[PDB]
Amino acid sequence: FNPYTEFKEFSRKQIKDMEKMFKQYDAGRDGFIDLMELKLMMEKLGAPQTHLGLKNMIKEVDEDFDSKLSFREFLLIFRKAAAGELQEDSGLCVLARLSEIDVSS
């Protein structure tokens, strides 16, 4: 997986920032963000989401159906944000917003 070739709508700086955020919250260092890790992320961003909200966030981008997020799937959150596909103030909209990445730039 070369993210730089799949996600050309983002600069190298933006992808590296997304990587830093991903790695920050992958507490277990296994290369994925699972439900509890995402729960902790949203708490720390200051916008805790409900259990179902969290589950639904993962479902929106969980392209290989394993119920956790790889880095590529994490980038899909930002791709969806940038494509105008996220519902206003849904959990993923909030994640992208509160993150240091502004996909509208």
Instruction: Name the site residues for Ca ion (rule: CB under 5 A).
Output: 26, 28, 30, 32, 62, 64, 66
Give the separation between CA 59 and CA 51, rounded to whole angstroms: 13
The distance of closest approach from Cβ of residue 61 to Ca ion in the complex, given in angstroms and rounded to an integer, is 8
Of the pair 28, 104, the CB lying nearest Ca ion is at: 28
Residue of closest CB approach to Ca ion: 28
Using CA atoms, how far apart are residues 45 and 49, in angstroms rounded to an integer?
Answer: 11
At its nearest, how many Å lie between Ca ion and the CB of residue 29?
Answer: 7
- Is 30 labelled a binding residue? yes
Dihedral of the CA atoms 90, 60, 51, 104 (nearest 10)?
-30
Give backbone dihedrals phi and psi of 69, rounded to 5 degrees, phi first.
Answer: -110, 125
CB of 69 to Ca ion, least distance (A): 6
Cα(first)–Cα(last) distance of the chain, in Å?
Answer: 25
Whether 34 has a binding-site annotation, put simply, is no
Residue list for the binding site for Ca(2+): 26, 30, 37, 62, 64, 66, 68, 73
